[PDB]
Design a protein around this ligand. Structure first.
Ligand code: SF4
Ligand code: SF4
Ligand SMILES: [Cl-]
Length: 252
């Protein structure tokens, strides 16, 4: 195959060399704190590091779509991926509702840390989102606890193992529900040497059974509490990716 994969640069190798995507930075708030993230910068799960985007209101974001779709025609996808957690900001839903209603041809895409995916998947479906990226760095909460300072869920900040268990249970429930609703799911995993760099095999097996379409293993960008960790070398990353390809399709 369907068009939401074939023409999405992040879900098809062929589409990456042919079609473009644009991000609308309408979602400044975040609801967790990753130990590799400095909040000054656009969510590094779905952005190159060290970037500071101007935050747009839904109306301004629609205006940027208008102008981009005028100067360029290769644009197939419009997404919200930052600067914080898209599902933690009502402006995400207002923006994609405006874009989808005016430009039904565009593929609507979102990235999420997954915490609010169970609570908001019904909204995403109703507004026409067909592609969802979830960043899943652990399927064992004792490993998750090593990756997150805290999560904010339903008006309470949690730390430690409790926070990790709340996050993981919601990520899995949300992915399951997204798959049930025939959404195309991509899972990002930040490869963190010494923390989840062999656990990623367990992640791949789990998301494969759950119906995730593609897996994107990203090398750690050392920052914040992980600033001292030596990132995986390129050849180290390709070796893991090559092995994980026998479990689930890898984004290359
Ligand atoms: S999800 Fe993590 S990396 Fe992304 S903005 Fe929130 S704390 Fe930073
Ligand atoms: S949110 Fe992620 S998958 Fe969607 S267009 Fe942006 S980079 Fe690609
Ligand atoms: Cl389609």
């Amino acid at each position: 195959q369907l068009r939401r994969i074939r023409e999405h640069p992040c879900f098809s190798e062929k589409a990456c060399h042919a079609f473009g995507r644009m991000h609308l930075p309408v979602a400044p708030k975040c609801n967790i704190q990753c130990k590799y993230c400095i909040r000054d910068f656009d969510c590094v799960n779905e952005s190159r590091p060290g970037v500071t985007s101007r935050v747009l209101t839904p109306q301004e974001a629609l205006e940027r779509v208008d102008e981009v779709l005028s100067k360029y025609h290769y644009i197939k996808v419009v997404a919200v991926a930052g600067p914080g957690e898209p599902l933690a900001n009502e402006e995400t839903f207002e923006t994609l509702r405006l874009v989808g209603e005016k430009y039904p041809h565009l593929i609507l895409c979102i990235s999420t840390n997954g915490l609010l995916l169970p609570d908001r998947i019904e909204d995403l479906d109703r507004i026409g989102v067909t592609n969802i990226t979830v960043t899943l760095n652990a399927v064992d909460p004792t490993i998750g606890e090593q990756i997150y300072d805290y999560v904010i869920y339903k008006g309470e900040r949690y730390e430690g193992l409790e926070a990790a268990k709340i996050l993981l249970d919601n990520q899995l429930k949300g992915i399951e529900e997204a798959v049930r609703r025939k959404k195309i799911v991509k899972v990002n995993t930040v490869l963190i040497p010494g923390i989840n760099d062999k656990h990623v095999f367990d992640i791949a097996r789990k998301i494969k059974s759950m119906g995730v379409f593609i897996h994107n293993v990203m090398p750690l960008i050392p920052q914040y509490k992980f600033a001292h960790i030596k990132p995986p070398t390129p050849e180290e990353k390709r070796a893991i990716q090559d092995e994980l390809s026998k479990i689930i399709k890898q984004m290359r």
